[PDB]
């Protein structure tokens, strides 16, 4: 079929409430390991710093005087002390600060983005939830933390405990790999929760996600809005002349 369904759950209870429809060219693409490779290696090149530096014989300190006479000494002739053959000489072909970045067509990078989403979709590792995706911390703790009654030590020890038993109950913790939460904007509870308990998972903002980030953990828990915005910004090879992008099949039962 040209379109595929996408279930939108309520994050805490994981109740399927709504049903959206996307194109098969969005979440049902074939697995292209060569295209995913070019995108993953393309991001690493741009992340690299590339600032290593070594001195050549033209940059090593000292005078360029001739060390020994050209002949008469019985030893091997020598020029400057900065030669690579000498003790503290310069590395001829040593590292220099340069740009390690490579190029990748916007259309290939957009195909690798939807190919990574399709890899998670066809495997059941893509969970779309309703907007407002945050960890439902207890109201009692939230009331204390704001009040300032709780110390930093206890405040962090509780979040680490609640987040652990919460992820372990959902089978989303360190035992079942990990989970990557993707939201449109930063959320205090979600990001603060996984900043203190990172073994159970992590949280990212849509602007900070990469193709590699969509393949590291065991599942991708993304918001309904972030997914639509993620695919809408990575379909350059498709919208060139549209297809189903968030077509609501079943509305939430208000």
């Amino acid at each position: 079929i040209t379109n595929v369904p996408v279930t939108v759950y309520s994050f805490p209870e994981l109740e399927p409430r709504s049903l959206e429809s996307y194109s098969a060219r969005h979440l049902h693409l074939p697995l292209r390991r060569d295209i995913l490779h070019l995108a993953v290696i393309y991001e690493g090149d741009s992340t690299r710093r590339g600032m290593a530096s070594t001195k050549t014989r033209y940059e090593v300190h000292g005078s360029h005087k001739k060390m020994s006479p050209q002949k008469g000494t019985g030893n091997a002739r020598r020029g400057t002390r900065q030669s690579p053959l000498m003790k503290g000489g310069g590395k001829t072909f040593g590292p220099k600060p340069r740009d390690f970045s490579t190029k990748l067509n916007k259309k290939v990078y957009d195909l690798a983005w939807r190919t990574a989403l399709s890899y998670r979709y066809k495997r059941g590792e893509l969970i779309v939830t309703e907007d407002g995706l945050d960890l439902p911390l207890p109201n009692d703790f939230l009331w204390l933390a704001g009040g300032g009654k709780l110390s930093r030590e206890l405040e962090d020890g509780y979040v680490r405990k609640w987040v652990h038993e919460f992820m372990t109950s959902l089978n989303w913790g360190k035992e079942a790999g990990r989970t990557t939460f993707i939201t449109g904007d930063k959320r205090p509870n979600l990001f603060t929760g996984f900043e203190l308990a990172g073994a159970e998972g992590r949280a990212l903002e849509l602007w900070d996600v990469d193709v590699k980030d969509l393949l590291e953990t065991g599942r991708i828990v993304i918001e309904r809005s972030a997914l639509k915005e993620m695919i809408e910004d990575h379909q350059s090879d498709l919208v060139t002349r549209g297809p189903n992008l968030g077509e609501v099949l079943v509305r939430a039962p208000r």
Binding site: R33, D34, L36, H37, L38, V40, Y119, K212, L215, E216
Partner: protein, 243 residues
């Protein structure tokens, strides 16, 4: 196992790396494919060097010159103009101007000194259109007019075309009038726009004027000629008879 530990490029994409001077069994050791103690091994030979023999460019010399004043025209064939109208990418009901030709993708994405209509596929072109270009072939003019259309050749420049696409200049297939009897209606037309528009330039050179001044090219200055006048600004049609 992990997806990230299973990605690779196609095997045909990978090619052997040759690191020279790294042992005899590599096949490139101890000489790196240079030979034995020659100029090509010690130093470098200039690329233009032939050993001393004079190159042909000297014994024969360079022929001709490169024209630095010729206009670079974008070539458009009727074969392609028909393919666009049928596909629905060019509206034949409206005037086809350079703005619509450039924004259609029929001449590409590069704007040049002008657009010339050529007559490839003139046997199958039967669509009535109203096109305006900088130049046109004698075959294209007949093909356009035979199908029931109109064609006009107007003076353009590389800078005028950019302003047309950018919307800074409005298209017009008529020259700027001359005389104190048109200053009012022209100034009023400018005030009504309420927006700063650049005028399309008119030809200034002898050749450019003569081109758009003759009816063979359907030039937009041909109306300035008399039925017996010549387009040339210097030459005249001689008279026949006994005198």
């Amino acid at each position: 196992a992990s997806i990230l530990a299973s990605l690779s490029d196609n095997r045909g994409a990978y090619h052997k790396r040759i690191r020279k001077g790294r042992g005899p069994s590599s096949g490139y050791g101890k000489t790196a494919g240079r030979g034995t103690k020659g100029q090509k091994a010690h130093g470098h030979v200039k690329p233009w060097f032939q050993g001393g023999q004079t190159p042909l460019i000297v014994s024969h010399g360079r022929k001709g010159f490169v024209n630095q004043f010729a206009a670079d025209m974008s070539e458009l064939n009727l074969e392609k103009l028909q393919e666009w109208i049928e596909a629905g990418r060019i509206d034949p009901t409206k005037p086809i101007t350079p703005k619509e030709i450039i924004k259609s993708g029929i001449i590409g994405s590069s704007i040049k000194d002008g657009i010339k209509l050529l007559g490839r596929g003139k046997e199958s072109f039967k669509i009535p259109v109203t096109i305006t270009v900088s130049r046109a072939s004698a075959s294209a003019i007949e093909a356009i007019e035979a199908a029931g259309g109109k064609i006009v050749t107007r003076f353009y420049t590389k800078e005028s075309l950019k302003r047309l696409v950018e919307g800074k200049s409005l298209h017009t297939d008529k020259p700027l009038p001359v005389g104190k009897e048109h200053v009012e209606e022209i100034l009023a037309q400018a005030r009504s726009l309420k927006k700063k528009y650049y005028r399309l330039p008119d030809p200034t050179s002898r050749w450019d004027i003569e081109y758009y001044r003759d009816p063979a090219h359907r030039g937009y200055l041909s109306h300035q000629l008399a039925p017996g006048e010549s387009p040339s600004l210097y030459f005249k049609v001689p008279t026949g008879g006994e005198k």
